[PDB]
Enzyme design. Structure first.
Site, PDB file in Angstrom:
ATOM      1  N   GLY A  74      31.103  25.286  42.723  1.00 34.55           N
ATOM      2  CA  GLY A  74      31.985  26.116  41.903  1.00 34.55           C
ATOM      3  C   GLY A  74      31.194  26.951  40.943  1.00 34.55           C
ATOM      4  O   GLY A  74      30.171  27.617  41.314  1.00 34.55           O
ATOM      5  N   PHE A  75      31.661  26.972  39.699  1.00 37.50           N
ATOM      6  CA  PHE A  75      31.128  27.886  38.694  1.00 37.50           C
ATOM      7  C   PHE A  75      29.863  27.261  38.073  1.00 37.50           C
ATOM      8  O   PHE A  75      29.925  26.174  37.509  1.00 37.50           O
ATOM      9  CB  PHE A  75      32.211  28.205  37.642  1.00 37.50           C
ATOM     10  CG  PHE A  75      31.762  29.189  36.566  1.00 37.50           C
ATOM     11  CD1 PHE A  75      31.138  30.360  36.915  1.00 37.50           C
ATOM     12  CD2 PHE A  75      32.074  28.960  35.195  1.00 37.50           C
ATOM     13  CE1 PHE A  75      30.780  31.342  35.943  1.00 37.50           C
ATOM     14  CE2 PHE A  75      31.687  29.886  34.176  1.00 37.50           C
ATOM     15  CZ  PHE A  75      31.038  31.081  34.528  1.00 37.50           C
TER      16      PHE A  75
END
Ligand code: HEC
Ligand code: HEC
Ligand code: HEC
Ligand code: HEC
Ligand SMILES: [Ca+2]
Ligand SMILES: [Ca+2]
Lengths: 355, 125, 376, 125, 376, 354
Positions: free
Chosen positions: E68-69
């Site tokens: 993800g981030f």
């Protein structure tokens, strides 16, 4: 004449004959040895000031008059934000509208009315000469003209360099005359990158000509009642100080509990802090902001009392967008902010900094 | 164009990586995704936290303190990427550190990085 | 000649020099108008994607919308809203799938509806504009489902709720003609009319077959809901036109976009959004180039323009770039939008002279779809 | 390189877009992300659905049916992207259409597109 | 000189001519070995990201993991697992945030654990390896939290559960030295040793201060957990070395990576992962180039190699590309890995001669981080 | 002699003297006129066959012998899948081991023992000649040698070109001798792209030299009991057909309910379908597979009965990975598959196709 008008206000400012029993002048509560604030202890310590009757206490802390002349007259800007004016709730439009009010307030100088103030001015041959030279013959015989003229002189006097000298260490450093310590510099860097800059700087962006570390706006930061001050003022356990909403003409309930952002100039020598004098120490005023950000148990506790900060007096309209910054000030950054705010002290009050 | 060369500010085009206020920007210029030099694009959330740098303005010979703010809550814009690091210090001096996603205080707790605005907050010292 | 970033530097220096304050804030996009254009970036099948909102007249990005995996964009013709049907997963591209419709306010770009679609019903495919479609009142969104079988999902935008799936025949695409009726194209070569009530099996009528089995209709026809005109090119550039304005399909004389001579010279349409239609001018724009018959998804460098009523050629433009998709603004003196997937850039041309006026680059990873509102 | 030119198959490098079995591939070659010509990379899920094309093999002069299968459940690999469309028909002829994400039947109902493999399943006709 | 795609065409063609059958299936990656290398792609802050698993010896991608981030990757030194701490949102980059740790099998790359981190506690920052760190026994993952204040999260990998946050002083980075102890670097210029348990205030002891306030230590020091050796360059290429192998910090003599003449002529380190350390050879590798002092994150084109005991220069390699990050395999005859964010390409060099041996391109959008296991 | 052996098996295959009452031969149930399946109607239609005694019915449908010679001997492959052998449950290793079983099965040919088979063989002068020429003098005097030699001849006969001629339309099209019609070509494209090719094609990839449209594996596709056939078989309503698990030596519970994938050659003419003959029509067999993929209520319904298909006989080990494909065959694809499967009919059975 600009000179002579301020000179007249200088005389009035120190003259106790503007109070009912003649015990009290502007300078009694706005003491120039204490950055124009009140050094006298009453029933609530230094939180609120005692009136000319010797018994009546107010319900708000006496603010400095230093830099009050840079505040714009009260107005609503295009964002729908109220700005400017005088008193913690902006109920006076400007210095001139403000000046007459302590004179007639029965918890302050307690004169019964304008005619009584005119009769005190008329008793003094020096006032007959100085008033008439500026405002015309007969000015002191007309209670309304005399009162408005005194307010004019007093507002002129607060507009002089004496009240706003811009000679703090911060000003010197900004002129390139000196440098901050690493701790003061770290405190400046914090102040301008954390949420303090969102309310305690003149402008939203760009550079101010004459910075006084307030945007002149109104915000509820969720302060508790100061109970010994509130007990001393006699307003009652059921009284609520609505801040800006108490200004005649404001009816918007969103304004309840909002107070004018004070200038931080001289803050280090003008304790106790906030509109009700509730915090004694400057460190404690800073720590209050961590209640909105920190998760530590200590952040809920007022270090002067060992008890929780308390329920906001007005538990709606809090400036949560700005207060809930997501970042807690650790002790090093509180240290740095104290150091920085001490650089906002005018040169003549630097000797006060030790005590 | 020589990436290792000393950075040379200009005051004629805010979409370029050499624009004077972008001296410690890390990310994307908000002007290129529907914001402006100092405003966020529609749909994004303006952080309250910032990073600072002292950026020399070649228009008036003065250095100004730029308190960068992120617009958050959207995937990275991908337009006008730039990374400059004038005066930029490591993460243990965070007020000067520009790898951090400075989205704290953004409405709705938005924490994804979209672009950065470049407003002035003071003169250098 | 002064660029947007130059005029912005000058405005910012003048503010600074004059002491003009302004509060850092979230901008609103300007009001939707005829020259607003939307570019969707499916990003070569990436799990997350972007849409760019662009002011065609200034050549400026005025905002962005994020989407998930192969989203379908729709834009209300009156400018009142935009929306997409989208798909996300609990761990990037793996785990529990959620399909949903979002409606956005077209100036704040804030979601005003988030409507979950039960049982992951979207068709995951390279983006075809008419696989998700608004009814002309704007109150209903219709999306296509391919698995387990062709079906069409009805989403009530007004009540913000999915309603039901409609069972249909072996058919593809969704062209809405009324609050309760849409047309699809069937494998067998007819169109199907699907008339639907709040509840019940739909009423489904087919037209006659209008093309032979060996004539191939492209995945990207142009449909003007306000004209009720379906413009459908084949792989050879033969153009079928179906009038749906009476509420029933009437098949117009077929037109050829390319001449017999050019066809034998290997001229063929090719790209992604190969065809555009301008309602007010009644005009058809087609991306074409010289190409092998099975290079039908490559970029083209020319656009031909023809009168929809007669089929006479009006112009042939050399675009000057590798263009995958085209569309036009629906106002007078329209812009012709020519998107290059490879350059990631939207080239903005005068649709009359074909001259390039301006361009917007850095539009994601593999931008492919252009959408405009027909506001007139 | 001339993209509009008739495609010319080769039989000497499976990582190139002109390898003979990739004649109707759309996406990414699995051999470039840890699979092989006819196997999925680790962590991904092999679909049972497929698309078909008849691909001419320049080596033996025969035409084989390649029934493409997707490897699913990961973001797109981003390596060796290719789009060829030999005999590719529109979506209403789906057995020959390659814009469709053919992840049906994948374990765990994986449906995101990572890459495509190119197995031979018959001779053409 | 035959490429991997060429070898594979040759083999496929022999299977086809021989009539050899094989079942299409999911491959296992080859067993983790000294020459496996992982490249993480933070993708210039994109909301989703990728890690590439590479066999350095063949220069071949053998797998990928999605993140993800700005996820933080860790690789167990013994090859038993890999893991990351990662962050997703319910609608791509907006809505409810979930931070989690996933552990993966190093050959099937399936998640063997997915552990939720309560209250969204990860530090979102451009990727620093020693902001998320395994204890030497592989049982506990430690991650840094910045907001609301510096803290360290303890994750039990064996029990598959989040344990607790620890409050720490104003410090950064996490170098684990024992199942229950790690060191951090403080704003004040000391290290802090943090010994912790399941509950109670951890025991925090600061070392002496070891550097001035105006010497700047990079965000990417090299840490060899098996040697207990912390190698920490400053912006000028002065290198601090701290020996943690006793369990307490011992300050080694500082060495200068660049000569006085090179420094006078503008040589400085620069990039992202600017430093690597080979445990068995006790050698330090530093990315350097001629550059202005505030261009410390730009790529460099040279690597200096020096003896960590004496500071003597062993080599200076001309890399022949714009290199942002380096690392080395920890075996004999090691490889020197040279990652170019701008080329999206890992270049694999012989660490002894500095010669480029092979390369792996198309590694995402902005790859920055190289991780290898010390299996020796 | 391979020729001789097969010619002997050709004689045995039609000889009713191998049944107890001389009423049936292999060819009675595996009728060469019907692609080596049973045209006779019994108590359960054509679902199960009647044995030599005229009353006993089996519990499984009589399969074709065409192409049965292409099946490998029973084994477990390296992926742990059982493959090959003979009978729907694989219980015989190969055609040789299979041939002796109907002879001795009391519900089929019903010979009491190998000795009784030998005695019938030895009573025919032609068999004395043909057997002794191939196996040696006295072969028929030894019940064990005789019965093994008869099985060898029958297996040899089943391995000739006549059981597996590869002359179907499909074969002609693959040799480039003609083309599919559009409908057949569609059906072929669907067959090789949908789930059918995962089980009904010899190889996983590549091209088979002699395709018979089975991978020789064992699957439980979740078929319901055939009620009238189960009744006719007399095995009792309590009985469960466990498929491959019933093979002696198979002990693995995961093989319960699994049956050998049949070759689809001649499928169009060897109805009814499945191991228990439960579906009479080829289209119904194909529609059965929609039960795993379609959401239409009609997919739950057996079109031959208008009632639900019925619970699987064995509810575990269903091949769900392969069956739950995510895609429903519409009526047009069903039509195309039928047309394609009709092209797997050997040339000599094309007249049957009407
Ligand atoms: C008994 C103490 C007392 C005396 C005497 C007094 N004041 Fe004050 N002053 C106060 C208090 C209390 C407030 C704040 C009250 C409030 O906000 O409602 C105040 C507020 C003000 C303010 C507003 C400043 C700001 O930042 O909002 C000005 C200006 C001011 N006084 C000037 C004067 C002048 C001029 C005189 C003499 C005419 C005077 N005061 C007499 C106690 C006093
Ligand atoms: C949301 C606006 C806002 C923010 C953010 C804010 N302040 Fe204030 N501050 C105020 C207002 C309003 C008051 C007066 C509140 C009252 O008395 O009711 C105040 C009062 C103060 C005082 C007392 C001054 C006096 O004369 O009594 C100090 C010190 C102070 N602030 C410092 C800070 C620092 C340091 C920060 C950053 C940590 C900060 N403030 C952030 C609005 C703000
Ligand atoms: C009474 C009918 C009948 C007779 C007579 C008969 N069978 Fe069959 N045959 C069947 C049935 C029923 C099956 C399937 C039984 C099962 O799987 O349990 C079968 C299965 C077979 C199979 C395996 C086919 C496959 O695909 O698995 C072969 C081979 C076979 N028989 C050959 C013969 C030979 C040779 C003879 C003569 C010795 C013969 N059969 C006599 C009914 C008959
Ligand atoms: C999971 C493996 C598998 C898949 C997929 C599969 N089958 Fe089958 N098929 C079988 C097995 C096993 C049987 C025998 C089942 C039984 O009788 O127990 C069978 C039986 C049949 C029969 C009956 C033939 C006979 O002689 O009785 C037909 C027709 C058939 N399948 C066609 C298809 C078609 C068409 C498809 C694609 C829609 C398909 N199958 C998919 C394994 C499969
Ligand atoms: Ca005070
Ligand atoms: Ca049958």
């Amino acid at each position: 004449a600009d000179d002579a008008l301020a000179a007249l206000g200088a005389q009035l400012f120190v003259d106790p004959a503007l109070s009912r029993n003649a015990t009290q002048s502007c300078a009694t509560c706005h003491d120039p040895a204490r950055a124009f604030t009140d050094p006298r202890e009453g029933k609530a310590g230094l939180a609120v000031s005692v009136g000319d009757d010797g018994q009546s206490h107010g319900d708000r802390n006496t603010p400095t008059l230093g830099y009050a002349a840079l505040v714009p007259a009260f107005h609503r800007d295009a964002n729908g934000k109220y700005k400017g004016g005088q008193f913690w709730d902006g109920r006076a439009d400007d210095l001139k509208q403000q000046a007459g009010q302590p004179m007639l307030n029965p918890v302050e100088m307690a004169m019964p009315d304008r005619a009584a103030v005119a009769a005190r001015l008329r008793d003094d041959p020096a006032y007959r000469t100085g008033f008439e030279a500026l405002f015309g013959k007969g000015v002191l015989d007309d209670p309304e003209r005399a009162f408005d003229a005194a307010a004019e002189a007093l507002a002129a006097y607060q507009a002089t360099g004496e009240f706003s000298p811009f000679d703090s260490k911060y000003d010197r450093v900004m002129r390139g005359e000196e440098k901050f310590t690493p701790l003061e510099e770290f405190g400046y860097t914090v102040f301008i990158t954390w949420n303090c800059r969102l309310c305690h700087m003149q402008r939203k962006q760009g550079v101010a000509e004459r910075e006084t570390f307030t945007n002149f706006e109104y915000h509820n930061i969720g302060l508790p009642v100061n109970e010994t001050a509130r007990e001393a003022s006699g307003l009652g356990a059921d009284h609520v100080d609505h801040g800006l909403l108490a200004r005649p003409g404001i009816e918007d309930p969103a304004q309840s509990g909002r107070f004018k952002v004070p200038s931080l100039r001289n803050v280090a020598v003008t304790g106790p802090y906030m509109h009700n004098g509730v915090f004694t120490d400057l460190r404690t005023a800073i720590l209050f902001y961590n209640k909105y950000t920190s998760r530590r148990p200590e952040a809920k506790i007022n270090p002067e009392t060992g008890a929780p900060w308390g329920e906001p007096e007005v538990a709606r309209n809090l400036s949560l967008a700005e207060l809930q910054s997501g970042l807690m000030l650790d002790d090093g950054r509180v240290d740095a902010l104290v150091a920085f705010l001490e650089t906002l002290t005018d040169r003549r009050y630097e000797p006060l900094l030790e005590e | 164009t020589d990436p290792r060369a000393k950075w040379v500010p200009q005051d004629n085009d805010i979409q370029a990586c050499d624009y004077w206020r972008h001296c410690s920007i890390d990310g994307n210029i908000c002007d290129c995704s529907g914001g402006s030099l100092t405003n966020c694009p529609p749909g994004t959330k303006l952080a309250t936290a910032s990073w600072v740098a002292s950026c020399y303005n070649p228009t008036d010979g003065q250095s100004y303190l730029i308190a960068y703010r992120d617009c958050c809550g959207y995937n990275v814009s991908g337009r006008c990427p730039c990374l400059n690091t004038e005066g930029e210090l490591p993460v243990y001096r965070p007020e000067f550190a520009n790898d951090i996603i400075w989205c704290f205080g953004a409405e709705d707790d938005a924490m994804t990085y979209h672009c950065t605005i470049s407003p002035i907050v003071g003169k250098a010292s | 000649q002064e660029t947007q970033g130059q005029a912005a530097a000058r405005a910012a220096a003048a503010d600074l020099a004059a002491g003009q304050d302004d509060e850092p804030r979230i901008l609103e996009a300007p009001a939707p108008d005829a020259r607003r254009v939307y570019v969707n970036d499916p990003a070569h099948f990436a799990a997350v994607t972007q849409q760019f909102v662009i002011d065609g007249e200034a050549g400026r990005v005025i905002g962005m919308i994020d989407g998930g995996f192969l989203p379908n964009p729709v834009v209300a013709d009156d400018g009142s809203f935009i929306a997409h049907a989208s798909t996300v997963f609990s761990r990037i591209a793996r785990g529990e799938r959620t399909d949903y419709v979002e409606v956005f306010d077209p100036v704040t770009l804030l979601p005003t509806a988030d409507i979950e679609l039960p049982d992951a019903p979207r068709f995951l495919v390279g983006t075809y504009p008419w696989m998700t479609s608004l009814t002309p009142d704007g109150k209903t969104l219709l999306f296509y489902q391919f698995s387990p079988a062709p079906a069409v999902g009805v989403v009530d935008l007004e009540g913000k709720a999915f309603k039901r799936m409609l069972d249909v025949p072996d058919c593809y695409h969704i062209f809405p003609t009324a609050p309760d009726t849409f047309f699809m194209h069937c494998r067998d070569g007819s169109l199907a009319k699907v008339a639907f009530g709040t509840e019940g099996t739909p009423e489904i009528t087919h037209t006659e077959v209008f093309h032979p089995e060996d004539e191939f209709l492209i995945n990207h026809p142009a449909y003007s809901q306000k004209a009720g005109r379906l413009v459908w090119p084949t792989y050879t550039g033969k153009i079928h036109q179906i009038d749906l304005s009476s509420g029933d399909a009437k098949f117009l004389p077929a037109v050829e976009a390319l001449t017999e001579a050019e066809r034998a010279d290997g001229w063929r349409p090719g790209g992604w959004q190969q065809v555009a239609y301008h309602r007010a001018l009644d005009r058809i724009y087609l991306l074409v180039d010289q190409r092998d018959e099975w290079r039908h998804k490559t970029a083209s460098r020319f656009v031909v323009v023809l009168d929809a009523k007669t089929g006479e050629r009006l112009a042939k433009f050399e675009m000057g770039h590798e263009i995958d998709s085209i569309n036009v603004s629906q106002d007078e003196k329209p812009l012709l939008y020519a998107l290059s997937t490879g350059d990631k850039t939207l080239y903005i041309h005068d649709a009359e002279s074909g001259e390039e006026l301006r361009s917007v680059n850095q539009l994601g990873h593999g931008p492919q779809v252009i959408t405009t509102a027909d506001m007139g």
